[PDB]
Amino acid sequence: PPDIMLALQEVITQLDIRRAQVLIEALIVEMAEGDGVNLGVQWGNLETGA
Amino acid sequence: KLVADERTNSILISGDPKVRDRLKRLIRQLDVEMASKGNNRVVYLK
């Protein structure tokens, strides 16, 4: 109907705006640093299991 | 008494030329603005 029409037209004109758009730049920084020291002296005498 | 057509959207009348005076008065009385009911709105969420 002509009102419902004039109405739908005023709804469509306000929903029909351009959409802005986002450039989502994520920035994942995985920075890992490991430091091990093994130092250990092993004596052994297999003639007599020591 | 009273008629109209919504092909034309026109008041028809049956009766007096007094009914013609006063009901041309009411021909004119409710013709005006539709007062922009804004029955519906579209609110843009912030």
Phi, psi of B42, rounded to the nearest 5 degrees: -130, 105
Count of helices and strands (H, E) across chain A: 1, 0
Residue in A4, A1, A14 with CA at minimum distance from that of residue B41 = A14
Closest C-alpha to B37, from A12, A16, A3: A3
Q: B3 near B12, Cβ under 8 Å?
A: yes
Chain A interface includes B37 (CB < 8 A): yes
Distance CA A50, CA B20 (A): 132
**Resolution in angstroms for this experimental structure?**
3.4
Say whether residue A10 is in contact with chain B using an 8 A CB cutoff. Answer: yes
| Rounded CA separation B14/A45 (Å) | 132
Residue with tokens 């091990």: A36
* Contact between residue A6 and residue A12 where contact means Cβ atoms under 8 Å apart: no
Would residue B9 be called left, alpha or beta, if left means φ above 0 and alpha means ψ between -120 and 50 degrees? left
Q: What method was applied to determine this entry?
A: cryo-EM
Chain B residues with beta carbon closer than 8 angstroms to that of A3: 34, 37, 39
CB of A39 within 8 Å of a chain B CB? The answer is no
Asked whether the beta carbons of B15 and B2 are under 8 A apart, the reply is no
- Are A3 and B42 a contacting pair at CB < 8 A? no
Q: What's the rounded Cα separation, in Å, for the pair A15 and A7? A: 13
Residue B30 CA: distances (Å) to CA of A29, A43, B22: 71, 114, 13
B36 at interface of A, judged by CB pairs closer than 8 A? no
